[PDB]
Amino acid sequence: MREIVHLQAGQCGNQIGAKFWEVISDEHGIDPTGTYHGDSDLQLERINVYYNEATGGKYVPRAVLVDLEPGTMDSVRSGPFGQIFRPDNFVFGQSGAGNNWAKGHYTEGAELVDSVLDVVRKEAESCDCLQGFQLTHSLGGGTGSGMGTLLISKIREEYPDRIMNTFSVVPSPKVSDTVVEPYNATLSVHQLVENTDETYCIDNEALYDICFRTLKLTTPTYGDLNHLVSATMSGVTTCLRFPGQLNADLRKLAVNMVPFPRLHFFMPGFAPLTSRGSQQYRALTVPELTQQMFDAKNMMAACDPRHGRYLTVAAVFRGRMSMKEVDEQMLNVQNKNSSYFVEWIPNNVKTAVCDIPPRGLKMSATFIGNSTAIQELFKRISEQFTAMFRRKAFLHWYTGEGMDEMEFTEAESNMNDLVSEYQQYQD
């Protein structure tokens, strides 16, 4: 049987994975303590793809937590669900991050890579057969990129036959907080494209826009954002867990998702988002789902694909639906904008329906997309990189770390190579 083990990397992933796991636990009816409340047979059947059986019906999460600053783990361990977490899975370093990519990639990683490798292969030997892995981290995060880039490089070779899912958040375009973040981003993304097969791109500003748009609650928490992204991550994982005539395997999805290897960046998409009175003002029907499901405002990932073209689109539908409404809606959207897809491929839609509604709502869906909107993303990181490297701003740290500008020369060339890679297919 095929299962998945998770990696919680970077200080963002520390919030990401924590919220991600508790949603799963609350979804499946396990108490914070760990003694599962036997309530649903189907979720009682397929928990072993993610959780193992411990003593007394305690379902251990199969994920490993790695960082440098103990305070993050302590809060994570002392969170509402850190007790279900294993100190076996708590590996860390005794040094300060400095949010230096090279420190976590060359200095701090070197003595921790052995430890994390031992832990993961022990967990790999704990399970029988995997689909692959998934990683909560960020491309612009000091530790997460540093450990992530190291770990993705190493994990490629020993199991070269599994699913290397990646989940990274893109920092705010208006402000990156960290000023060496674009250096960290460029350093990370150079290796990322070489290793990953699947990637999710997420931006905080759009989430804030969604908060302004449908949440309408003025002041949320970043955990509230964590709750939203976890639901998207939960929704895509609901495919494997739940029954119904939908083909769930990511490899089943991947073969339908990407025509050529270099396309690993994929954008999420989610279903009904509702405001104060509109919960009881909404006629919950497949059309209005589909209309909202395909909204430029309903986008959250990077930027409006209105600017670009639609290469491949894949929407998974969770709840009690039928093959016909999705079929005609697929026709309706196809007729609505037949030109707005690429003439390179017709029928670029991949549909799945999960017959099991979520715990709290019935009609729901999730979307994963690959359009030509990422050009806006790496163009921004490009002219950012130009200005700083033109006058080598903030450089003596990395040369002090032992890093040379030649490393960046292929990094930008590889990225600008991907710049040519997108449009010349598209335009």
Partner: peptide
Amino acid sequence: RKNCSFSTPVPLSL
């Protein structure tokens, strides 16, 4: 208040 308990390693666990 930070429950600085798990941070303690075996030589420094108190």
